[PDB]
Amino acid sequence: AQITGRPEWIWLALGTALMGLGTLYFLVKGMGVSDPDAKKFYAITTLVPAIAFTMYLSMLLGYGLTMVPFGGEQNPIYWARYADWLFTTPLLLLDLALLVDADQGTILALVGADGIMIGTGLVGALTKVYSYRFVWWAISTAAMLYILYVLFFGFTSKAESMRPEVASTFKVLRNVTVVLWSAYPVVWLIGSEGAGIVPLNIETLLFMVLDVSAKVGFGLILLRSRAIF
Amino acid sequence: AQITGRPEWIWLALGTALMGLGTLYFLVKGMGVSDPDAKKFYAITTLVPAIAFTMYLSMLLGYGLTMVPFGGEQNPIYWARYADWLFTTPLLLLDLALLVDADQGTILALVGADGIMIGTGLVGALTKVYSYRFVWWAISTAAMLYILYVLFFGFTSKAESMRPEVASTFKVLRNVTVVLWSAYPVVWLIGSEGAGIVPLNIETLLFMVLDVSAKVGFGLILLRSRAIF
Amino acid sequence: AQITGRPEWIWLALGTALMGLGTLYFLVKGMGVSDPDAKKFYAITTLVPAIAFTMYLSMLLGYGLTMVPFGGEQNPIYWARYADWLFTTPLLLLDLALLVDADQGTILALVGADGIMIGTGLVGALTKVYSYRFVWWAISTAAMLYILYVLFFGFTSKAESMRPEVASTFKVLRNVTVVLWSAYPVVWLIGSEGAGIVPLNIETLLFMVLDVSAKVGFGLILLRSRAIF
Ligand SMILES: CC(C)CCC[C@@H](C)CCC[C@@H](C)CCC[C@@H](C)CCOC[C@@H](COP(=O)(O)O)OCC[C@H](C)CCC[C@H](C)CCC[C@H](C)CCCC(C)C
Ligand SMILES: CC(C)CCC[C@@H](C)CCC[C@@H](C)CCC[C@@H](C)CCOC[C@@H](COP(=O)(O)O)OCC[C@H](C)CCC[C@H](C)CCC[C@H](C)CCCC(C)C
Ligand SMILES: CC(C)CCC[C@@H](C)CCC[C@@H](C)CCC[C@@H](C)CCOC[C@@H](COP(=O)(O)O)OCC[C@H](C)CCC[C@H](C)CCC[C@H](C)CCCC(C)C
Numbered sequence: 262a263q264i265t266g267r268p269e270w271i272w273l274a275l276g277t278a279l280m281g282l283g284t285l286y287f288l289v290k291g292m293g294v295s296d297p298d299a300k301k302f303y304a305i306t307t308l309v310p311a312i313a314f315t316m317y318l319s320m321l322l323g324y325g326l327t328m329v330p331f332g333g334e335q336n337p338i339y340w341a342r343y344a345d346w347l348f349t350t351p352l353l354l355l356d357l358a359l360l361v362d363a364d365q366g367t368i369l370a371l372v373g374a375d376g377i378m379i380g381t382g383l384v385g386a387l388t389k390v391y392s393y394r395f396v397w398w399a400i401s402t403a404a405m406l407y408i409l410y411v412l413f414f415g416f417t418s419k420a421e422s423m424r425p426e427v428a429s430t431f432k433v434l435r436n437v438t439v440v441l442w443s444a445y446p447v448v449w450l451i452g453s454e455g456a457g458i459v460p461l462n463i464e465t466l467l468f469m470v471l472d473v474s475a476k477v478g479f480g481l482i483l484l485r486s487r488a489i490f
Numbered sequence: 491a492q493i494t495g496r497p498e499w500i501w502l503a504l505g506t507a508l509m510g511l512g513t514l515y516f517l518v519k520g521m522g523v524s525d526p527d528a529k530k531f532y533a534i535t536t537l538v539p540a541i542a543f544t545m546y547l548s549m550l551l552g553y554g555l556t557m558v559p560f561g562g563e564q565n566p567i568y569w570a571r572y573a574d575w576l577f578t579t580p581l582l583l584l585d586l587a588l589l590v591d592a593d594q595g596t597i598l599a600l601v602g603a604d605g606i607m608i609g610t611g612l613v614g615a616l617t618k619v620y621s622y623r624f625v626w627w628a629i630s631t632a633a634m635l636y637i638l639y640v641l642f643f644g645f646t647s648k649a650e651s652m653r654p655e656v657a658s659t660f661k662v663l664r665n666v667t668v669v670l671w672s673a674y675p676v677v678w679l680i681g682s683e684g685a686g687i688v689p690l691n692i693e694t695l696l697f698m699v700l701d702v703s704a705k706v707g708f709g710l711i712l713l714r715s716r717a718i719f
Numbered sequence: 720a721q722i723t724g725r726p727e728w729i730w731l732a733l734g735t736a737l738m739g740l741g742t743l744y745f746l747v748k749g750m751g752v753s754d755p756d757a758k759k760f761y762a763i764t765t766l767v768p769a770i771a772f773t774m775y776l777s778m779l780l781g782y783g784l785t786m787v788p789f790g791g792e793q794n795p796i797y798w799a800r801y802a803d804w805l806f807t808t809p810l811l812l813l814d815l816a817l818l819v820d821a822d823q824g825t826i827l828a829l830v831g832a833d834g835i836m837i838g839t840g841l842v843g844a845l846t847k848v849y850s851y852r853f854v855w856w857a858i859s860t861a862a863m864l865y866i867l868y869v870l871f872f873g874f875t876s877k878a879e880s881m882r883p884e885v886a887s888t889f890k891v892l893r894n895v896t897v898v899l900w901s902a903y904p905v906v907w908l909i910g911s912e913g914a915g916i917v918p919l920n921i922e923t924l925l926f927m928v929l930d931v932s933a934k935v936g937f938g939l940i941l942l943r944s945r946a947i948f
């Protein structure tokens with residue numbers, strides 16, 4: 262890995278403030294909302310960064326960090342990420358499903374594929390045998406591919422049969438999640454959890470940009486449109 | 491903290507019997523119920539103490555206790571509480587939401603705010619740095635405040651547009667949960683998990699009275715009325 | 720217990736392939752399905768073995784094994800089972816509930832009774848005091864009995880008021896789960912997690928036959944009928 266339990270601190274601390282202020286913004290905003298549908302969109306979307314803040318704080322305060330022996334060392338693995346992402350990604354996926362109006366069957370498949378992507382990714386992070394950490398990465402990425410597939414050629418189709426304001430916001434969000442989401446298995450692979458090419462200092466800066474984007478950025482695009490009505 | 495892994499035993503054992511008999515009572519009672527709505531109320535309400543019993547038993551049998559180093563010692567932290575409360579409090583919140591007929595958006599916000607209250611409280615209990623245990627307590631209590639706010643000025647409003655039998659049972663329950671619930675962060679703060687003013691022996695007696703009340707007491711008020719129909 | 724962290728490997732590895740190919744089969748099959756109801760059945764049913772594969776792999780790769788001191792030794796406890804079963808059994812129970820069209824109250828009772836059966840079984844597996852491991856087993860089995868009761872004299876009744884194709888597939892599935900499910904507490908009791916009569920080598924072969932049957936076998940009976948429409 263890339264030994265780091267203090268230099269990344271600034272990024273952990275900044276991600277804490279951003280997620281923290283991101284929650285605050287969505288909070289002091291859905292406040293007016295009377296429409297039960299928009300009400301659901303603000304609920305899901307506000308909860309995403311709210312969970313992100315607590316876990317980002319845990320990593321900053323040191324709780325979210327653990328040490329796992331693999332290779333020929335003891336590696337600094339921030340597990341709070343998996344704790345965050347486990348509820349955050351299925352919540353993000355529900356916004357997309359509600360927006361486009363997906364079947365209860367597909368929403369269950371997606372949440373299921375997602376829980377598996379995060380749990381499997383968690384087992385990979387905590388696995389002591391260097392070689393095996395890549396098997397789980399393979400299985401985790403495979404599930405993401407399954408998820409990004411229906412989001413693309415599946416939700417897109419169900420979108421075009423909705424009001425244009427809705428068809429387009431989804432278009433924008435769809436692109437943002439498919440692009441952002443696929444960066445995690447890459448950062449993970451080259452980062453301190455896989456082939457230690459990139460230092461934890463950097464891995465943490467990357468995850469931060471992606472997180473704030475995948476949640477607050479995403480939330481902004483959504484919450485600031487009439488598609489949620 | 492307040493070193494204790496045997497004197498509180500009587501309270502752990504009594505809370506076990508009470509939760510145990512509380513489940514039994516609700517069990518041999520919803521037995522007749524044919525109304526699918528009352529059927530849901532008995533389901534949720536019976537599951538609350540049923541979960542409470544197992545966790546109370548774990549603490550009595552010693553499993554639910556762990557030791558966390560903070561201050562200048564090794565402190566006896568009963569973590570089973572957080573394991574219990576994590577499912578129990580959202581279940582309790584669903585009874586109130588069903589009774590008053592809340593929006594899927596607000597129920598999601600509440601369960602979300604609640605999961606955060608318990609998890610955050612759990613991180614606070616397990617945190618080794620004395621100072622930080624209070625940050626999480628602050629964040630956990632803040633979420634409770636958010637929860638007790640909608641239960642009060644939110645559910646109350648939605649209650650008044652229901653049959654009077656319903657409007658009033660909620661009134662009673664609302665008061666019981668807002669009053670009881672806000673005692674936990676106080677007991678926690680002065681107890682062995684925070685400023686060790688109160689001994690674990692006592693902290694455990696308090697949590698017991700509050701638990702049995704917040705669940706069996708609460709359940710009795712609810713299940714023994716026609717509001718569940 | 721029955722010391723084993725390598726001879727059972729072949730069964731762990733075989734259960735991995737079977738669950739793996741079982742998922743694959745259901746995958747390249749619900750592919751056509753346009754009916755949102757059948758769509759839900761394929762979702763739930765495919766997710767069951769998909770989760771089973773990951774956990775079976777964890778046990779094979781060594782991650783799902785831990786050592787618990789009880790009796791006068793350090794016993795090899797495969798905890799991944801409880802991780803698997805926690806989502807898998809409630810999912811299996813939802814197929815039965817959807818098929819027969821159960822009330823939201825009873826589905827909640829069942830999932831609740833089930834979470835308790837697995838968690839309680841998990842506490843029993845991890846408990847260091849030999850004597851106590853049987854208390855949890857008693858509580859876990861009691862919950863299973865509650866579950867198998869409604870599946871039998873409860874769902875059966877609700878089945879007979881459905882299309883005959885549906886009434887019968889449920890009949891078959893009902894029998895398969897009640898029979899298979901009740902074998903787990905027996906295997907557990909005589910296996911390495913309880914009265915070490917049976918060696919881990921064998922306990923693992925038994926759990927494997929039961930798992931593949933309870934999921935892939937079950938799934939086949941269901942997915943290969945028109946009852947899911
Ligand atoms: C720093 C931060 C990160 C700390 C973390 C705390 C955090 C864990 C708790 C917050 C939980 C949130 C993440 C949960 C998501 C909340 C969103 C879903 C809210 C969306 O809106 C849902 C509605 C539900 O009511 P209706 O059915 O009537 O429409 O909120 C009802 C709207 C209400 C009626 C209007 C007022 C709402 C405000 C926000 C609540 C009042 C604030 C409380 C009194 C706490 C005050 C703070 C303390 C310190 C005094
Ligand atoms: C000591 C205790 C704490 C041990 C803990 C065990 C515990 C974990 C398991 C219990 C799980 C419960 C907490 C789950 C909540 C249960 C409540 C929701 C029940 C509410 O009612 C729901 C209905 C569902 O059926 P319908 O759709 O037809 O209406 O129950 C159907 C009603 C049925 C049809 C009538 C009979 C119901 C009884 C209660 C079930 C029979 C009991 C079993 C045969 C076990 C017997 C005991 C063994 C030792 C012989
Ligand atoms: C070896 C294995 C065990 C690795 C484990 C990975 C695993 C964790 C991920 C799989 C998750 C699954 C368990 C989740 C269950 C999936 C089932 C519910 C699918 C049932 O069907 C649901 C529909 C939803 O779309 P509609 O609403 O339009 O009907 O699937 C939509 C049908 C789509 C539109 C048709 C094509 C579906 C295929 C299966 C998806 C394409 C495959 C991806 C491109 C990944 C390709 C593999 C990589 C290596 C190239």
Ligand SMILES: *C/C=C(C)/C=C/C=C(C)/C=C/C1=C(C)CCCC1(C)C
Nearest residue numbers: 349382401402405442445446449475
């Ligand atoms: C707010 C957080 C978001 C949107 C996070 C998304 C995270 C992922 C898509 C993670 C994917 C992973 C893999 C595909 C394999 C390796 C491990 C993970 C967990 C990093």
Ligand SMILES: *C/C=C(C)/C=C/C=C(C)/C=C/C1=C(C)CCCC1(C)C
Nearest residue numbers: 578611630631634671674675678704
């Ligand atoms: C049956 C159990 C009930 C109703 C429990 C309710 C528990 C709480 C409201 C706990 C609140 C907490 C805080 C507000 C902060 C400190 C930590 C907790 C978890 C004790």
Ligand SMILES: *C/C=C(C)/C=C/C=C(C)/C=C/C1=C(C)CCCC1(C)C
Nearest residue numbers: 807840859860863900903904907933
């Ligand atoms: C796919 C897996 C299935 C269908 C598993 C079912 C498992 C059980 C019914 C387990 C039951 C247990 C008890 C009744 C008590 C002892 C512990 C358990 C968890 C083995």
